[PDB]
Amino acid sequence: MASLTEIEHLVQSVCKSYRETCQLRLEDLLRQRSNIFSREEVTGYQRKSMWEMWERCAHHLTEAIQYVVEFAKRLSGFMELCQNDQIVLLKAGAMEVVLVRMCRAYNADNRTVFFEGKYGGMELFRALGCSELISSIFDFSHSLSALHFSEDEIALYTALVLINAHRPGLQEKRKVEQLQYNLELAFHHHLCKTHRQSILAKLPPKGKLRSLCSQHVERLQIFQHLHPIVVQAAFPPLYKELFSKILHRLLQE
Ligand SMILES: COc1ncc(Oc2c(Cl)cc(NC(=O)CC3CCN(S(C)(=O)=O)CC3)cc2Cl)cc1C(C)C
Known part of the structure; x- marks a missing residue:
């Protein structure tokens, strides 16, 4: 199944769907690189209460997830699954x-990430009380930055991150398997064509993305146990549904 021309057509539609849902264009993020939070602004963030920082981060993560949901809805094969x-x-x-996607907003030269209009270092998030997770995210972004991913590579790699036939709970495993296989052929074909197959051995293990996500769910549990009404009253409904329906409504539209 799937010939060379169909594989190349899949590469183009995956890259197109990603450009339409990338949230911020690469140039927009790169143009802001010398716009860095001052010492006074960093201090201001560290002095914010733990629950105010948690609400702001949950809000920014929810916006980012909304673009990922739209990417999935436009992803060839996804809406055809149950x-x-x-x-x-x-x-x-x-x-x-x-x-x-976060590696695009990360500057490896000074170890800063784009957040609320400017670039700031890991110390900006000290008030969350989850410094091991924040450093793990910055390390992960640093490791991805060393690969120098093109926008097309990001599009193809993230399509495979989402189209994983081994997720527990899938009713039509074969359908997800076939779609994952075509996306993997598209990704490997594009790397072979561009002479970039050397990135394959440098891509992170599947367990690394899973550990970062498990750490996020665990730190959220600790926060929620201490501040339950903050989560109930001021966290985005989509965020609570995913990590603590909205998704059904988002996909139906
Ligand atoms: C997992 O838990 C977390 N992941 C990241 C966290 O900190 C952030 C947050 Cl919340 C936002 C940004 N930045 C943005 O949201 C801006 C965004 C960057 C990505 N671009 S993009 C997709 O265009 O490249 C769009 C703009 C960066 C960091 Cl470190 C916090 C948490 C938990 C512990 C609460």
Whole structure:
């Protein structure tokens, strides 16, 4: 199944769907690189209460996830899977897709990430009380930055992050397997064509993205146990549904 021309057509539609849902164009993020938070602004963030920082981050992550949901809806083959399988793939892979896309907003030269209009270092997030997770995210972004991914590579890699036939709970495993296989052929064909197959051995293990996501769910549990009404009253409904329906409504539109 799937000939060379169909594989190349899949590459183009995956890259197109990603450009339409990339949230911020690469040039927009790169243009802001010398716009860095001052010492006074960093201090201001560290002095914010733990629950105010958690609400702001949950809000920014929710916006990012919304673009990942739209990417999935435009992704060739995804809307043809059943609703249960669409939701199983998004619940397990939306945050993983966000963590990979995040490397585009990371500047390896000074170890800063784009957040609320400017670039700031890891110390900006000290008030969350989850410094091991924040450093793990910055390390992961640094490791992805060393690969120098093109926008097309990001599009193809993130399509495979989401289209994972091994997620527990899939009702039509074969359908997800066939779609994952075509996306993998598209990704490997594009790397072979561009002389970039050397990135394959440098891509992170599947367990690394899973550990970052498990750490996020665990740190959220600790926060929620301490501040339950903050989560109930001020966290985005989509965020709570995924990590603590909205997804069904988002996919139906
Ligand atoms: C997992 O838990 C987390 N992941 C990241 C966290 O910190 C952030 C947040 Cl919340 C946002 C940004 N940045 C943005 O949201 C801006 C965004 C960057 C990505 N681009 S993009 C997709 O165009 O490249 C769009 C703009 C960066 C970091 Cl470190 C916090 C958490 C938990 C512990 C709460």
